[PDB]
Swiss-Prot record, chains A, B:
Enzyme class, spelled out: transferase
Similarity-based family: Belongs to the glycogen phosphorylase family.
Record's protein name: Glycogen phosphorylase, muscle form
Site (Can be labeled by an AMP analog): Y144
PTM comment, free text: Phosphorylation of Ser-3 converts phosphorylase B (unphosphorylated) to phosphorylase A.
Activity regulation statement: Allosterically regulated through the non-covalent binding of metabolites, being activated by AMP and inhibited by ATP, ADP, and glucose-6-phosphate. The activity is also controlled by post-translational modifications including phosphorylation.
GO biological processes: glycogen catabolic process
Domain of life: Eukaryota
Species for this entry: Oryctolagus cuniculus
NCBIfam families named in the record: P_ylase (TIGR02093)
Length: 810, 810
């Protein structure tokens, strides 16, 4: 059908067909008379997977021979989503598989919908790791993603009576055809115990052992025959574990619980023992694998020339004292030499400045669980602070501020401080965020070691986030500028030459309308919800958080509703307002925000006077596969966090690439997006970081805004009085009370400017041709936000390796 | 190499080779440069498994079309052992696979040793189920084995300091290539709750749900292209289970523990809740599957014409009240009609008369866990006892004896009574055992319903237990009488014509010597133990139990030792005495017996005066794969249980078929073995059942034997005084005290006759030609003990179906 999907050659189609039938028979043990769509999905998955095998084996063989510097990306989260389509795209098999299945009487799109998301992350941080793996493979880097194979990923969200309910995501129930268990490379991980000091160094003894069993998933690069590995560890008890008899066998679950479930908090630290066990488990198993591979190339001076470890936030920070432990206690290196190796090997990426998100582990927990690591952390701290004292003599308050050990009611270790001390590079994830790091929370560290601090603005992979989810747009683009942009997204700038081309304008607008029709249809089928496909699709999808200000969106929606009720017969641009995202199960205010949104929908969607001029829809169970459907359908992207709070954002970039205009604050990467597209082509509003600081200095008083803005007062009165909850009039009191007396995110302060900016959005939507022209200017300047650009920068500026677009032989 | 192993055709060998290489690449994702023997085993297993698929699909298709009566064999235990060789044997692929692997530079025997036993049973009862499945497939019956897929089977036994230690049998660690998960046929099972009575019958409500997920294993018949199914259920929690958040997900293990571990007691009832859950779980899931398959053929009058359910002991006895529950509560049949259907569908096999082995469940447990089933059991009991009262008016003690409900400190349900009331047939497992049932524990039931009681003497499959484990013997037999005997074992009678044939005598003796050399070699390799291969191999392998009297064997061994010490320079026939078996982890006396055996070895094996005239070896970790090695090597089979205690025995039959002579009591199937071979060709000794009864009537006084037999007194003094435990002189006091004051199994009473009989064994071993002639007479008359004979009898006399030796088309 479409060119970017590759060729459907007769020989290939014929071979895919027979391999599909072979798997259906020999692998699934079914005949076509009792096979279900799920069986057909599996037969296709095994057929496609077979094409990865040769490339996977030859890629790993190649790294063994060439011995390049290896990149180890450590993360507690990898939000991969579905794998089938991505694999076809990267191997150029999509059209051929479409043809083969069609000849077999099957609709491939239908089979794709059967696959479960691999949801081993919470949101942005996890999904960034996934885009990064795709880019590292596409750029030919010898890169390995290491994490935990959670049995249960991020929970499935059900909405019941307008409230979030959670159910376990049993993603492995039907099997996972994309992983290969490797029980032969199982490794031991130690916990608890005690330290004993001998004539010959420290020894960690009397430990409990848990086994780490690896499962390997292939990561194909884009049409370059490179297939890298993501290795995820699963916890297993040893067979003599606890070894009356029956109870000892049942108690094996204590050990195996380490890999059972993903902690479901986004941007929030919960200091539980099980989480600490997960963090050490991934680090300890991974480092043994790293050292093994390094020895199979005795002198660790070359270690940093052959190994880079990138810490995705502080969650794998124990890699620093673990590497020291191994080098000092096991390999017998002197401390100073070991520390030199460690610093040159490790680099740290920070993804947040919110205080409640920073990891500060109680000393008593580390003391019990990881006694030798605590000793090492203390020694690191003493040596570090000796350097600080030498650099800033007499500055005693600096010593307390910079210490890895925090004093107080309960002593804690600040893991960010540990990572900075033990890494040769520290980066933020968007220019404004990296600046904020140097000016505020890490200022002291920047003054001691300015050379460590860098920026690496985030990106997204244009394979998944354009070619895969929006083939219509990819095609009309390729028609004008060829296919090269898929691995060189900066080529999209060539599209500026078409901003006055009538045919292109029409095609861009047509693709959006088709995407909107398709999404409107999906809504009716799977959720029996009707929507007007000619309305402006106004979408805010991301995790539910106070800092992301879904509440500000709600205030605008109610404003719109109230204005319609006031002048029913006045024309207003019709909108469908869609808000989706998951709340952490323990985050009460986030759960209340979900209920407010559905409550607003209950009123608005059933008021005859509104008609279909305004609809408010809560999109249930937002996840990667849903993002792939809704983002291509969106007209307006809401990126409205309080300035200074969203470190980068990446949903923002997905919307830009897919033909939505953005309404947003000057926060995170929004700043760079506006810079690339031009401020005239972006709907910017609200306080800047400097304005937020000014307000904090004089004191934020929400009452002032309530007193001066009658439309806002009306909304608050509606909320308090029970207008949106007739049977439970005080249902939203916690929300009102937060907004009026302890709003850390200054929702009222940006309300007036937000509403006025939304009016400018509506005015532009009334002129389709100029709306589309502005869309073309955004798509055309989205190239900087490819994760290929991001990864090339990490490679050259942190890891010391050169990317390559050269193909291995098939 | 050898004929019974089939043909090695060029086309087949070529195809096996390329499929082996294909699996190594695509399935295992390895190249030959990093592959290990384990990878090679897996590649071979997948290659062989592919040959099962077509036959498996076509067999099950065939049953769907023809709609024959289906046989459901319900068991909590299936002791399958290894699958690779058995599969090759039954598909005629052994020689071809041997040739293919040899051409690839691999030794197939080596690869076979990598496979784990599937050890989902304790011993005889579990292994009987496995032989039965093989026979049902070989006889073309539409038969299904249903059980539980335990994550951990029977524990691995390690001996440390002469004591048994247990370690978990993590048999699934590397995967199981022989099963197919079928998550699509998952079914709900209910627990707890309460009963509510409506206008329209009872309703079981407020239950907790556990899901039963099936895994299917193929069961190939011998060269007939039939492949039946063994379906084993695994426990899974529902996704809303327990649904703070993290704890709710971790608590899923409560539900999943149902299928975690096999209870490791042989012939001993332990009344624990988890065991009851396992029993209901298998029954409830299985019955839904049965009914489903029956409806997909509304009138249940035909149910017994289309379904037979065989209960392997009382462990699945809840099938009776569950079937009633489904028919009465769900399908709305009247009670009397439902009971008629149930009785005609169910049949019960009893495997023990030991009181401590009989299941008697506390009423309070059933009341809490299965409230509706308890109501039904009460109703069954009332109606049954009404029949008894009508038949035996005024006999009130009979009413209390026959009741399903036992009165006392704690009320219990007698599950054997339930099974008899609810089955149209009840059988024992050897003629003497079936007689014992009618004369003692089930006498009252036999008087009420004589027609229900039958015998079905046990058997073993001659595929695994001759062709597979003793190819040398199978071949020298086939040379004389052709290959037909492998599925018609009665043809072995033809061998009586060769009892005076000098060439045959020599060949039989040669095969035994080769087996003994091979086993002696295995001992040195894997256990660094040296043995004299010219000695008489005297073996007792079976679970460790007081009733099996390993202790009597020990007394003979010590007698032999003491006699040598007394007259060192007198010639005695050299023996290697091997004893193996597992003790239940909580069975203290059994663990003490293991320690006594190793203790005797420590003394005997290191006494220079004994030399290699006597060796005592404890065979560690006895299991099906070890049985396949040691049984072909044995000269003397010890089958020495107290008369009346071993219901049948099946190890006895394995030894007979493999060229060992038997020393044994007239117990279980030993009686029928002696009858078939002739008493002159069997070493029979000891009390008969009638003698044991006589002694019990006058009172067993062990002191009498001690007082009259000086050789016995000497042994007891040695045990008490610390001769076999220098550092812990009173280590064996529990044993001595049991033997002298509370021996339920009358070890001393059979001692004199046992020792004298062992002397006759030694005298015959001195004459190789006559030893071998007697061996030929045993092998030649072992035909009755094929499980094909047994299954043909169940089919004709209980299930109402005809066996068939006709081949399906390949
Ligand atoms: O090896 C992990 C899984 O191995 C499956 C298995 N997987 C593969 C396999 C084979 C090829 C593959 C190629 C790409 C990605 C994944 C791949 C996986 N071979 N065997 C078993 O079916 C499953 O129970 C087990 O957990
Ligand atoms: O850099 C990728 C993304 O990382 C998100 C992010 N996620 C987390 C996060 C994610 C999971 C966490 C779990 C425990 C403790 C803290 C945690 C913090 N921190 N930062 C940022 O909010 C977003 O702007 C960003 O684009
Ligand atoms: O389906 C059960 C197992 O399915 C394996 C699988 N097994 C088969 C299969 C395929 C053919 C078979 C033929 C005979 C016996 C067993 C057979 C099993 N196909 N897929 C997966 O690799 C494993 O993770 C999963 O538990
Ligand atoms: O019939 C097969 C075999 O069954 C054995 C047998 N095994 C059990 C057994 C096995 C497991 C049990 C678990 C719980 C409670 C009772 C249990 C009883 N009962 N009988 C007999 O001892 C043997 O002579 C016999 O040949
Ligand atoms: C991209 C993405 C995110 C990140 O969105 P932000 O708006 O940057 O927070 C979260 N969840 C999913 C499923 C995504 O695909
Ligand atoms: C046959 C067999 C048994 C049964 O032996 P008995 O001597 O009849 O108790 C027990 N265990 C294993 C492994 C077997 O193969």
């Amino acid at each position: 059908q479409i060119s970017v999907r590759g060729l459907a050659g007769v020989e290939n189609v014929t071979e895919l067909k027979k391999n599909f039938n072979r798997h259906l028979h020999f692998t699934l043990v079914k005949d076509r008379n009792v096979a279900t769509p799920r069986d057909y999905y599996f037969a296709l998955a095994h057929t496609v997977r077979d094409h990865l095998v040769g490339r996977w084996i030859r890629t790993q063989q190649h790294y063994y021979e060439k011995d390049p510097k290896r990149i180890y990306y450590l993360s507690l989260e990898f939000y991969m989503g579905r794998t089938l389509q991505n694999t076809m795209v990267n191997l150029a098999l999509e059209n051929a598989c479409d043809e083969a299945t069609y000849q077999l009487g099957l609709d491939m799109e239908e089979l794709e919908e059967i696959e479960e998301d691999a949801g081993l992350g919470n949101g942005g941080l996890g999904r960034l790791a996934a885009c990064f793996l795709d880019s590292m493979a596409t750029l030919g880097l010898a890169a390995y993603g290491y994490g935990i194979r959670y049995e249960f990923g991020i929970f499935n969200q059900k909405i019941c009576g307008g409230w979030q309910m959670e159910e376990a995501d049993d993603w492995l129930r039907y099997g996972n055809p994309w992983e290969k268990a490797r029980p032969e490379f199982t490794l031991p991980v130690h916990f608890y115990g005690r330290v004993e000091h001998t004539s010959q160094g420290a020894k960690w003894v009397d430990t409990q052992v848990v086994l780490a069993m690896p499962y390997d998933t292939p990561v194909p690069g884009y049409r370059n025959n490179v297939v890298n590995t993501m290795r995820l560890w699963s916890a297993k008890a040893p067979n003599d574990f606890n070894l009356g008899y029956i109870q000892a066998v049942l108690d094996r679950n204590l050990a195996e619980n380490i890999s059972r479930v993903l902690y479901p908090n986004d941007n929030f630290f919960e200091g539980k023992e099980l989480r600490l066990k997960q963090e050490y488990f991934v680090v300890a198993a991974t480092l043994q694998d790293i050292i093994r591979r390094f020895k199979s190339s005795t002198n660790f001076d070359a270690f940093p020339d052959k190994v880079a470890i990138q810490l995705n936030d502080t969650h794998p920070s124990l890699a620093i004292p673990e590497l020291m432990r191994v080098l000092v206690d096991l390999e017998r290196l002197d401390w100073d030499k070991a520390w030199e190796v460690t610093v040159k090997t490790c680099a740290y990426t920070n993804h947040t400045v919110l205080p409640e998100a920073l990891e500060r582990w109680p000393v008593h927990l580390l003391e019990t669980l990881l006694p030798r690591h605590l000793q090492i952390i203390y020694e690191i701290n003493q040596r570090f602070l000796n350097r600080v004292a030498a650099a800033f003599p007499g500055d005693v308050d600096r010593l307390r501020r910079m210490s890895l050990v925090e004093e107080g009611a309960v002593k804690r270790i600040n893991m960010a401080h540990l990572c900075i001390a033990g890494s040769h590079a520290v980066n933020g994830v968007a220019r404004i965020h990296s600046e904020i790091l140097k000016k505020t929370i890490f200022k002291d560290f920047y003054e001691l070691e300015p050379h460590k601090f860098q920026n690496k603005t985030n990106g997204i992979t244009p394979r998944r986030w354009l070619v895969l989810c929006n083939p219509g747009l990819a095609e009309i683009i390729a028609e004008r500028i060829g296919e090269e942009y898929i691995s060189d997204l900066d080529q999209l700038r060539k599209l500026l030459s078409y901003v006055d081309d009538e045919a292109f304008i029409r095609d861009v607008a047509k693709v959006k309308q088709e995407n909107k029709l398709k999404f409107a249809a999906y809504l009716e089928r799977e959720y029996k919800v009707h929507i007007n496909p000619n309305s402006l699709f106004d979408v805010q999808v991301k995790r539910i958080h106070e800092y992301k200000r879904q509440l500000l969106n709600c205030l605008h929606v109610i404003t719109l509703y109230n204005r319609i009720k006031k002048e029913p017969n006045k024309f207003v641009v019709p909108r469908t307002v869609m808000i989706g995202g998951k709340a952490a199960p323990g985050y009460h205010m986030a759960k209340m925000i979900i209920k407010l949104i559905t409550a607003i929908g209950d009123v608005v969607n059933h008021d005859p006077v509104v008609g279909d001029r305004l609809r408010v829809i809560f999109l249930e169970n937002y996840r990667v596969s849903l993002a792939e459907k809704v983002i291509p359908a969106a007209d307006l992207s809401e990126q409205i966090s309080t300035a200074g709070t969203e470190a980068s954002g990446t949903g923002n970039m997905k919307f830009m690439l897919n033909g939505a205009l953005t309404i947003g604050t000057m926060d995170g990467a929004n700043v760079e997006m506006a810079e690339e597209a031009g401020e005239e082509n972006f709907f910017i509003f609200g306080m800047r970081v400097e304005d937020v600081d000014r307000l904090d200095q004089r004191g934020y008083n929400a009452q002032e805004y309530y007193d001066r803005i009658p439309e806002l007062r009306q909304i608050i009165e509606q909320l308090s009085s029970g207008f949106f909850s007739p049977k439970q009039p005080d249902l939203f009191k916690d929300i009102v009370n937060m907004l009026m007396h302890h709003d850390r995110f200054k929702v009222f302060a940006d309300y007036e400017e937000y509403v006025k900016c939304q009016e400018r959005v509506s005015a532009l939507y009334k002129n389709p041709r100029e709306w589309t022209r502005m869309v073309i200017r955004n798509i055309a300047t989205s190239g900087k936000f490819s994760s290929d650009r991001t990864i090339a920068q990490y490679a050259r500026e942190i890891w010391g390796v050169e990317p390559s677009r050269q193909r291995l032989p098939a």
